[PDB]
A = this chain, B = another copy of it.
Amino acid sequence: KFLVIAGPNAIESEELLLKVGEEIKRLSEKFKEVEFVFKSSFDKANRSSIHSFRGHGLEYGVKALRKVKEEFGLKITTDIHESWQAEPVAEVADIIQIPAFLCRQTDLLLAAAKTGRAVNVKKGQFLAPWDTKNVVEKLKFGGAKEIYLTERGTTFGYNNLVVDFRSLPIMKQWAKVIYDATHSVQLPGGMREFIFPLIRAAVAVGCDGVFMETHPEPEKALSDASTQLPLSQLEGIIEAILEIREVASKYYETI
């Protein structure tokens, strides 16, 4: 079924996760035609500034995510940054996420694959669609069976990203494809106004799921504040993508 990966960008507090998990749980019951996966990072290991919010550590993060899964029965996904983290994270994460800048780090991919969990690799901003074939091959060699590739924009000049929708059908040749509606519109070093329009494009073109960050009060977010979606708007967007997918899917090209 269609995958919807959503949650607050960073684990600002297990409290925040619970509030967002509650809504995601509700939508989960309302849209049985969708597989929801709760996402949140225990650490922002690649911030531009040394003075920016990183998180409360792996232990606190895995604990809070464990709370969400136990209290709501929702699948979990979070990203790892160094090989040693794969094992402890796999204790709770159904899907281990690989950061865009780290999509070429062989040991991180192999460590993720070794856990037996599904792996979702964020496509590096420096990678071409066809360059992802090798990424999948690494994961398969490592024993991974459920593999996702996420479109999150490509470097387009300085401090800007562009989404080449041709990437969706190309990557689909070797993995399930997810469209990251949040990071794709962020200006490195974004505009929330383009989030919905581009997500409509993604489903019209055809993808296996959508990744969207949501926060009760985006303005107060300690990360991706400019692009996280207000929690209250999540339901409407999900319904919209299901409606567009229902009609457009008739035209999705084979493989």
Using CB atoms and an 8 Å cutoff, list the residues of chain A in contact with chain B: 45-50, 54, 81-83, 101-102, 104-107, 124-131, 134, 137-138, 141, 154-160, 162-166, 168-169, 185, 188-189, 191, 193-194, 196-198, 200-206, 240, 243-244, 246-248, 250-251, 253
Which residues of chain B are within 8 angstroms of A45 by Cβ–Cβ distance?
105-107
Give the nearest-CB partner of A107 in chain B. B45
Which residues of chain B are within 8 angstroms of A158 by Cβ–Cβ distance?
128-129, 131, 156-157, 160
Which residues of chain B are within 8 angstroms of A54 by Cβ–Cβ distance?
106
**Given known A101-B101, A164-B156, contact A134–B201 (CB-CB < 8 A):** no
Q: List 28 A-B contacts (CB under 8 A).
A: A47-B106, A50-B137, A54-B106, A81-B107, A82-B82, A102-B105, A126-B126, A127-B189, A128-B158, A134-B189, A154-B155, A154-B162, A156-B158, A158-B160, A162-B162, A162-B164, A163-B164, A163-B165, A165-B197, A165-B198, A166-B191, A196-B251, A200-B205, A201-B205, A240-B250, A243-B248, A247-B247, A247-B248
Which residues of chain B are within 8 angstroms of A205 by Cβ–Cβ distance?
197-198, 200-201, 204
Q: How far is the CA of A248 from the CA of B199 in the complex (A)?
A: 11
Contact of A131 among B129, B162, B188 (CB under 8 A): B188
A41 vs chain B, min Cβ distance (A):
13
Give the nearest-CB partner of A130 in chain B. B189
Which residues of chain B are within 8 angstroms of A138 by Cβ–Cβ distance?
49-50
Which residues of chain B are within 8 angstroms of A251 by Cβ–Cβ distance?
196, 200, 240
Q: How far is the CA of A204 from the CA of B200 in the complex (A)?
A: 5
**Given known A155-B155, A164-B162, contact A101–B124 (CB-CB < 8 A):** yes
Contact between A204 and B203, CB atoms less than 8 A apart: yes
Contact between A107 and B82, CB atoms less than 8 A apart: yes
**Given known A166-B191, A168-B197, contact A49–B137 (CB-CB < 8 A):** yes
Q: How far is the CA of A240 from the CA of B125 in the complex (A)?
A: 32
Contact between A155 and B168, CB atoms less than 8 A apart: no
A213 vs chain B, min Cβ distance (A):
18
Q: How far is the CA of A107 from the CA of B81 in the complex (A)?
A: 10
